[PDB]
Write a protein that binds this ligand. Sequence first.
Ligand code: 7KK
Ligand code: 7KK
Lengths: 260, 258
Amino acid sequence: PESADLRALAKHLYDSYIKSFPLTKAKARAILTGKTTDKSPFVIYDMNSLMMGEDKIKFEVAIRIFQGCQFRSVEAVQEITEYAKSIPGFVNLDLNDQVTLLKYGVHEIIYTMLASLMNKDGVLISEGQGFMTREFLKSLRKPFGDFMEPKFEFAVKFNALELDDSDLAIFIAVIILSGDRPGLLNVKPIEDIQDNLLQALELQLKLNHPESSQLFAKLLQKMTDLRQIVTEHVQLLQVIKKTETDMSLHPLLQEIYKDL
Amino acid sequence: ESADLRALAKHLYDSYIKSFPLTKAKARAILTGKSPFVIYDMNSLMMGEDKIKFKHITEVAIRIFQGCQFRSVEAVQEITEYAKSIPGFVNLDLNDQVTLLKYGVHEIIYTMLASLMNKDGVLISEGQGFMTREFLKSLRKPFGDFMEPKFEFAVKFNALELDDSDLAIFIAVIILSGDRPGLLNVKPIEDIQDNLLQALELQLKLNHPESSQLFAKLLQKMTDLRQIVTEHVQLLQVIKKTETDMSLHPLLQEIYKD
Ligand SMILES: O=S(=O)(Nc1cc(Cl)c(Oc2cnc3ccccc3c2)c(Cl)c1)c1cc(F)c(Br)cc1F
Ligand SMILES: O=S(=O)(Nc1cc(Cl)c(Oc2cnc3ccccc3c2)c(Cl)c1)c1cc(F)c(Br)cc1F
């Protein structure tokens, strides 16, 4: 059928998702649901546990954390780029559009996938070896303590959809191939790819979550919260560049930030 | 067991046809008879960009190099899809799948590039273009040194007169190499390659029965490929002391491995 092609596209993206992202939601949930003994994380909830964490978990304060996010976000950009090239049709696009799709897509994907590593109490860090609590992060001096709470508020609502990795692989593919990004040269080929991806996502959610009514529509409506959080995130960054003139940002990230 | 070798051969040929747009058959038609814009000097290349719409347009030697980056990245995705059709490949360890492609795309890129080359140049852009061998080696160092070893290999490789049905199995043999570093389960890889080698052997005896030991000679070319690729990557390390734009887009840098 035409839907056999949609299933092959879904399988293809899931395969590439596993190869590109080392820490899946399936692994994050096994670590968080306290399943076992070999996978349990060390919990950073204050400065001493944080001090004992660097000893044990292997990776001022608040600025030590902030540059940790920078470095992991840079690694995430790398992983998202590799995944993007696997999306059929992406690498055949105008190279300026490729750059543009990655530039405006990376932050929406980072905090989509970060939700996989969060519960209401905190977030897994450092390949899941560590867990940082929501309270300790909200306790960081301003304005660093303002970074995390919106993500937690989004993650709780996003995670109630109970998507698995196979669902997420298509959803991230849809996000990358967004024809409404500023400065795109040929919007139509991008939209034709997203059309096929949206078709693939719809069949996937309906087959994977048959009792979940209108999950497709509810997933698409999550973009409002996604884009609101990116907007707040970049404003937070601008406050940092002014009060924190003695702290460098990463060039890959600064070029992504340009005109955000 | 001979029917399943031929079944395997036909399956790979069909998959190769679907995965790679410009086949050797059509490339050879364009290079002889039954027409490409030719790029022979600085002026013709500037005209060719206003002619053929290059999707990578954002020094001339660097602009050609960036074009090779763009097309190589496209070919990785074509080769990846072709690898998925090889019986047994997807059932392999996911990390081994990734390792085979990562260390194998370069050998395949220059195997298939031979299809688009003769002693005088190389087809580009689905055949809409053609870049002369003279112009490419006229490029300033070290960019003028990338392609000459490829032409030398290609003139020899093409003298074997392989067709797409031959090359389909040959490329499959290259992907399923058990000697790539970092593999975790070598047994089923070489198990599949030995099965592809039997199919390649029978294919060449049926399709070139007058070509004595063509099978052995094809295998000898695979070591010529290894040398091409080792020399190629060593040259693109020297590049990161020439094409080093201290003000380059990091996202472009992120895209351009492969
Ligand atoms: O929520 S953020 O908006 N972004 C965010 C980005 C990533 Cl990649 C991230 O993941 C990691 C992973 N490993 C880590 C290892 C060591 C230290 C921190 C890590 C963070 C997390 Cl937990 C948060 C945000 C939280 C803040 F606490 C600070 Br300070 C700034 C900051 F940007
Ligand atoms: O021979 S190479 O070793 N690699 C190589 C790789 C591919 Cl995919 C290739 O095919 C194309 C196809 N379309 C193109 C369109 C525009 C511009 C270049 C294209 C190259 C070719 Cl002609 C060469 C090599 C040749 C050099 F001229 C330069 Br500068 C560096 C370089 F790596």
